[PDB]
Amino acid sequence: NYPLASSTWDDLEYKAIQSVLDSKMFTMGEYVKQYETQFAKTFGSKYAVMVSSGSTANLLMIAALFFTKKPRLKKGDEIIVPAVSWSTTYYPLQQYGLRVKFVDIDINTLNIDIESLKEAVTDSTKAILTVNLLGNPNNFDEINKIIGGRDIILLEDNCESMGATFNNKCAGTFGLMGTFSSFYSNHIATMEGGCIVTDDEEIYHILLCIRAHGWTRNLPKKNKVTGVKSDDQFEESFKFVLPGYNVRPLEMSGAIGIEQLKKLPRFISVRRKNAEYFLDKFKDHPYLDVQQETGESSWFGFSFIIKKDSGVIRKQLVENLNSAGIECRPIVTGNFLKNTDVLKYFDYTVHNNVDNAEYLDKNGLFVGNHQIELFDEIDYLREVLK
Amino acid sequence: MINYPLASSTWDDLEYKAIQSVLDSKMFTMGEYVKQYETQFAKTFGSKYAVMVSSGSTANLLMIAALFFTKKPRLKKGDEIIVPAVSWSTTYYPLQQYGLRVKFVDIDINTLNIDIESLKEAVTDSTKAILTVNLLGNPNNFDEINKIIGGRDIILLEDNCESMGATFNNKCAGTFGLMGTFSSFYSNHIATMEGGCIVTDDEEIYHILLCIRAHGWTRNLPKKNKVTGVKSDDQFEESFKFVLPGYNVRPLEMSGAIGIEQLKKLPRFISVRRKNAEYFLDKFKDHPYLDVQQETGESSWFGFSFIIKKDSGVIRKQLVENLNSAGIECRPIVTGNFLKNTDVLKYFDYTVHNNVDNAEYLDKNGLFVGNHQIELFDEIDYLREVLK
Numbered sequence: 214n215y216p217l218a219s220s221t222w223d224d225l226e227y228k229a230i231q232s233v234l235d236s237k238m239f240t241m242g243e244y245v246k247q248y249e250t251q252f253a254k255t256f257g258s259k260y261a262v263m264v265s266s267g268s269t270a271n272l273l274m275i276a277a278l279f280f281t282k283k284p285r286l287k288k289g290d291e292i293i294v295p296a297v298s299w300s301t302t303y304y305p306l307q308q309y310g311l312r313v314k315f316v317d318i319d320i321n322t323l324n325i326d327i328e329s330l331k332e333a334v335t336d337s338t339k340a341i342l343t344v345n346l347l348g349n350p351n352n353f354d355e356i357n358k359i360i361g362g363r364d365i366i367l368l369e370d371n372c373e374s375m376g377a378t379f380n381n382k383c384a385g386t387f388g389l390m391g392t393f394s395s396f397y398s399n400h401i402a403t404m405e406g407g408c409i410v411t412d413d414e415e416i417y418h419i420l421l422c423i424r425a426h427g428w429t430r431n432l433p434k435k436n437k438v439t440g441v442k443s444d445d446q447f448e449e450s451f452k453f454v455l456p457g458y459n460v461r462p463l464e465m466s467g468a469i470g471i472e473q474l475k476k477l478p479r480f481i482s483v484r485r486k487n488a489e490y491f492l493d494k495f496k497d498h499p500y501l502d503v504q505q506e507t508g509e510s511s512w513f514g515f516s517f518i519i520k521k522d523s524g525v526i527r528k529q530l531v532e533n534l535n536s537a538g539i540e541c542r543p544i545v546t547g548n549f550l551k552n553t554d555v556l557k558y559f560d561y562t563v564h565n566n567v568d569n570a571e572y573l574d575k576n577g578l579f580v581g582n583h584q585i586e587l588f589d590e591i592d593y594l595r596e597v598l599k
Numbered sequence: 600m601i602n603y604p605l606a607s608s609t610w611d612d613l614e615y616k617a618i619q620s621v622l623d624s625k626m627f628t629m630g631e632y633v634k635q636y637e638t639q640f641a642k643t644f645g646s647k648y649a650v651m652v653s654s655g656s657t658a659n660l661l662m663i664a665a666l667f668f669t670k671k672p673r674l675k676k677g678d679e680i681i682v683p684a685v686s687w688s689t690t691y692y693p694l695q696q697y698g699l700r701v702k703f704v705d706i707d708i709n710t711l712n713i714d715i716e717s718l719k720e721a722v723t724d725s726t727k728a729i730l731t732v733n734l735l736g737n738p739n740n741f742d743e744i745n746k747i748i749g750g751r752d753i754i755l756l757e758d759n760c761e762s763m764g765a766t767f768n769n770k771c772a773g774t775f776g777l778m779g780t781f782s783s784f785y786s787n788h789i790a791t792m793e794g795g796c797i798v799t800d801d802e803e804i805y806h807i808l809l810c811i812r813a814h815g816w817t818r819n820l821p822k823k824n825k826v827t828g829v830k831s832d833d834q835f836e837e838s839f840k841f842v843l844p845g846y847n848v849r850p851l852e853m854s855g856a857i858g859i860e861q862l863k864k865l866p867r868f869i870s871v872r873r874k875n876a877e878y879f880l881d882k883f884k885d886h887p888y889l890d891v892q893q894e895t896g897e898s899s900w901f902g903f904s905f906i907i908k909k910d911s912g913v914i915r916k917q918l919v920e921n922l923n924s925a926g927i928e929c930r931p932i933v934t935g936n937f938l939k940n941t942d943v944l945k946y947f948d949y950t951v952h953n954n955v956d957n958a959e960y961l962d963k964n965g966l967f968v969g970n971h972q973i974e975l976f977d978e979i980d981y982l983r984e985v986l987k
């Protein structure tokens with residue numbers, strides 16, 4: 214009845230898949246490059262690199278910084294992150310030996326708490342990995358003011374807020390790099406898929422290398438990684454130059470992605486009409502608070518946070534919703550800091566406390582938003598949550 | 600002249616029918632076809648378990664990572680792992696990515712695999728693992744290798760991405776190790792667009808693999824599992840429960856469907872490839888200036904290597920030009936001597952055992968041409984006329 218996701222595909226995605234089958238060219242190639250070109254143009258970045266998933270997009274975004282001619286990050290360098298996000302926003306950090314400093318969320322926007330950040334940022338701060346949660350962008354004016362002239366790298370995990378904007382600028386393009394996901398239930402879907410955008414040429418070339426075996430095939434002749442490639446094909450076929458991975462996306466995902474990008478403006482439009490209806494329906498709810506919008510959110514889903522002293526218990530809310538046929542979820546990692554076990558592998562610290570994340574973990578959950586009008590489902594959702 | 604490219608399509612109507620079936624279903628994310636494929640995969644090779652992943656590179660990544668995650672961790676940073684000097688780039692990276700101390704050992708110029716004698720010399724009390732690689736279809740001699748280990752605490756891993764279908768002593772390559780990796784890239788034994796697989800007989804490793812393949816969550820773990828012991832019944836609780844630092848390297852449902860079809864054809868593909876190898880060997884056996892690969896067990900012959908004989912006055916670049924002129928696609932023998940890679944090596948904590956002169960000689964004098972699952976008699980005659 215009210216599922217988290219639905220299909221974003223029509224006949225065009227199916228015909229694109231058919232074009233690839235017809236071409237018999239399956240390995241990352243022409244459609245992926247065209248998709249990358251369109252993607253960068255769509256969100257306003259100079260360059261885009263498509264990868265296997267938004268999670269390998271995050272992996273290369275962190276890895277890239279160790280491989281610049283002059284490394285931008287090194288083991289033990291401190292990186293600041295919000296206490297609530299997806300697991301693979303944090304794993305790469307652990308995988309590359311960074312010192313993770315968690316900062317609390319603001320219970321209203323669900324994004325990193327700006328006042329807490331202002332205090333967490335010190336001279337030891339090397340990067341801030343922001344997360345635009347559930348479609349809602351971070352106020353980049355405030356964040357950039359905090360950074361100021363400091364040598365702190367801004368990064369964005371934008372896997373939940375494709376299409377979101379702040380001051381007419383697309384989320385994902387504020388950081389030195391920004392990542393996106395095109396998994397099934399996201400704003401666009403390419404079966405699986407992710408993308409890294411950047412305007413930095415060295416970074417872009419490093420990404421081209423580390424995505425595909427750390428080889429030079431995808432680098433241009435004149436490039437920041439190897440300088441100038443040899444004109445001899447045998448010489449540049451298996452030439453390995455950086456410790457990377459094979460995280461190439463498939464030509465089908467690229468082909469499908471191109472059609473999705475064309476539908477994106479309408480998807481965001483509908484998703485925002487859904488949010489308007491929803492917020493109007495929930496504006497003055499007796500016991501539930503909704504996400505507070507920054508810039509223009511792309512509304513990935515609709516969160517609820519049980520109001521304090523409402524007496525309301527989350528467990529029951531969930532039953533009710535489920536019992537009513539309404540799919541729901543926790544708000545992603547909820548408080549990631551509760552993963553004591555996995556945290557055993559990290560080099561980390563917590564700035565101040567993550568009191569809001571804790572409250573969220575126990576009092577929040579989310580229901581779906583889609584690229585199709587959901588007025589009936591929202592009406593029902595409000596009734597069920599009488 | 601003649602068209603003799605490195606690889607050709609291994610698909611027929613059946614692979615397209617499989618894709619159609621996924622399309623009709625509307626379920627694209629890793630599911631039932633992948634599950635089925637893993638079941639068939641394990642059976643095909645004789646392992647208890649199989650875990651399909653996005654590529655043979657991500658299969659190697661998970662193979663190494665899992666060893667850090669067992670309840671009693673089987674490896675830790677700085678631990679010593681020995682690997683041959685020649686293989687694929689992604690055989691090496693995960694090693695550096697997990698902060699291991701890599702010990703390089705020369706290859707045998709005949710088999711193209713790790714030099715046994717050198718391996719025997721290299722194994723010390725500090726040796727924690729041996730990451731064997733069955734090159735170009737050729738399995739390692741696991742008897743000799745196991746003798747060397749001699750009931751000592753050294754884990755054996757195999758990177759079997761180039762030797763699907765090889766056997767040694769009636770045992771399938773990939774199954775000698777605690778773990779074994781395979782690739783299903785286009786130019787490989789079977790092809791699922793991109794694809795990899797890790798096989799093991801270890802239930803803990805199997806579960807660790809299932810967790811780290813997908814977000815480090817518990818979704819794909821059974822209620823009772825070696826990672827979290829016992830799952831909660833409350834799904835809201837197990838919805839997004841994160842327990843091991845993993846990745847998202849899931850394969851696509853289409854890849855699993857295609858793969859099932861591919862596994863049925865494999866035996867025939869191996870048959871054709873070996874008959875091609877027979878003709879090739881008969882044709883190049885007394886070549887005046889080129890050595891071929893010496894077979895161990897029953898090779899699956901991924902491709903046909905050549906190494907210019909010392910003192911021949913023959914130059915690789917020439918043969919390369921010659922081959923291309925003829926329309927014969929060729930490649931260096933994979934990484935060649937990986938030790939030349941100062942650019943990548945600067946990020947490693949490694950050492951070299953003795954020397955890698957053979958790997959060096961191969962690096963300057965070696966190359967390979969293709970083998971396919973379709974007869975290549977004319978193409979081989981042609982190749983023999985070109986390399987005259």
Ligand SMILES: Cc1ncc(COP(=O)(O)O)c(CN[C@H]2[C@H](O)[C@H](O)[C@@H](OP(=O)(O)OP(=O)(O)OC[C@H]3O[C@@H](n4cnc5c(=O)[nH]c(N)nc54)[C@H](O)[C@@H]3O)O[C@@H]2C)c1O
Nearest residue numbers: 237238239240459605606654655656687760782784785786
């Ligand atoms: C020891 C070891 N360990 C791990 C790995 C990594 O496995 P993985 O590649 O991550 O799955 C490997 C991988 N080795 C493979 C890698 O898979 C590598 O990508 C592959 O290199 P390649 O043969 O030079 O890749 P290629 O130039 O893309 O494909 C060779 C020919 O096939 C053609 N081709 C590739 N894909 C397609 C396709 O989809 N359609 C058509 N028509 N032709 C295709 C290309 O045009 C070439 O003519 O061969 C290497 C030896 C390995 O050797």
Ligand SMILES: Cc1ncc(COP(=O)(O)O)c(CN[C@H]2[C@H](O)[C@H](O)[C@@H](OP(=O)(O)OP(=O)(O)OC[C@H]3O[C@@H](n4cnc5c(=O)[nH]c(N)nc54)[C@H](O)[C@@H]3O)O[C@@H]2C)c1O
Nearest residue numbers: 218266267268299372373394396397398625626627628847
């Ligand atoms: C901050 C952040 N950073 C990084 C990432 C990683 O990106 P990525 O997932 O690696 O691309 C993410 C990823 N977030 C997503 C991930 O995409 C994650 O996998 C997802 O969890 P999920 O919504 O529970 O994914 P699911 O339960 O497997 O599928 C969602 C619904 O859609 C349905 N569905 C999924 N795939 C298909 C399909 O192929 N066909 C059909 N018909 N239905 C499908 C399922 O039945 C579910 O009801 O939602 C999370 C919020 C992120 O949030």
Ligand code: NA
Nearest residue numbers: 217218581582
């Ligand atoms: Na949704």
Ligand code: NA
Nearest residue numbers: 333334335338
């Ligand atoms: Na700080």
Ligand code: NA
Nearest residue numbers: 258386387412
């Ligand atoms: Na930008």
Ligand code: NA
Nearest residue numbers: 221399400584
């Ligand atoms: Na959507």
Ligand code: NA
Nearest residue numbers: 605606969970
């Ligand atoms: Na081949």
Ligand code: NA
Nearest residue numbers: 774775776800
């Ligand atoms: Na075995």
Ligand code: NA
Nearest residue numbers: 453454940942
């Ligand atoms: Na190199």
Ligand code: NA
Nearest residue numbers: 974976977978
């Ligand atoms: Na013929």
